[PDB]
Write a protein that holds these residues in place. Structure first.
Motif, PDB file in Angstrom:
ATOM      1  N   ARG A 198      91.007 -70.814  43.890  1.00 41.55           N
ATOM      2  CA  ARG A 198      91.490 -69.492  43.491  1.00 41.55           C
ATOM      3  C   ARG A 198      90.351 -68.605  43.003  1.00 41.55           C
ATOM      4  N   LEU A 199      89.322 -69.199  42.393  1.00 42.45           N
ATOM      5  CA  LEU A 199      88.199 -68.401  41.905  1.00 42.45           C
ATOM      6  C   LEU A 199      87.483 -67.705  43.058  1.00 42.45           C
ATOM      7  N   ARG A 254      88.595 -60.970  47.014  1.00 40.35           N
ATOM      8  CA  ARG A 254      89.407 -59.768  46.877  1.00 40.35           C
ATOM      9  C   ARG A 254      88.622 -58.662  46.187  1.00 40.35           C
ATOM     10  N   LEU A 280      89.729 -64.928  44.462  1.00 38.50           N
ATOM     11  CA  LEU A 280      89.637 -63.728  43.638  1.00 38.50           C
ATOM     12  C   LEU A 280      88.309 -63.011  43.856  1.00 38.50           C
ATOM     13  N   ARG A 281      87.190 -63.751  43.825  1.00 41.44           N
ATOM     14  CA  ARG A 281      85.891 -63.141  44.105  1.00 41.44           C
ATOM     15  C   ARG A 281      85.929 -62.332  45.393  1.00 41.44           C
ATOM     16  N   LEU A 298      91.518 -74.715  40.879  1.00 42.81           N
ATOM     17  CA  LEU A 298      91.013 -73.543  40.169  1.00 42.81           C
ATOM     18  C   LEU A 298      89.839 -72.919  40.906  1.00 42.81           C
TER      19      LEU A 298
END
Lengths: 48, 48
Positions: free
Chosen positions: B35-36, B42, B39-40, B32
């Motif tokens: 992926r966090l 992106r 995402l940050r 997790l």
């Protein structure tokens, strides 16, 4: 942090970014929220 | 607060709770977090 990314997407929506442009980012954030919620419920289940 | 979650995981481990369920949760927490940060990143590319 998760919170800041949630506030960043609200900001982008306030700035005119559309759902089609943000759909993949919003759906990834939602899944991470839900996976965090799951982990916390798994912890309560162990403690239970 | 993922640090808090990690602290709860380690506390439960010290208290003798299911070491295997705890390992599985630690593994999911690591994935997790990967992926966090992705995402940050992106979001940062879009520069608001």
């Amino acid at each position: 942090g998760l919170c800041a990314l949630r506030s960043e997407l609200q900001a982008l929506r306030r700035e005119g970014f559309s759902p089609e442009e943000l759909a993949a980012l919003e759906s990834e954030l939602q899944a991470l929220e839900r996976e965090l919620a799951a982990l916390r419920s798994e912890l309560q289940a162990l403690r239970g």
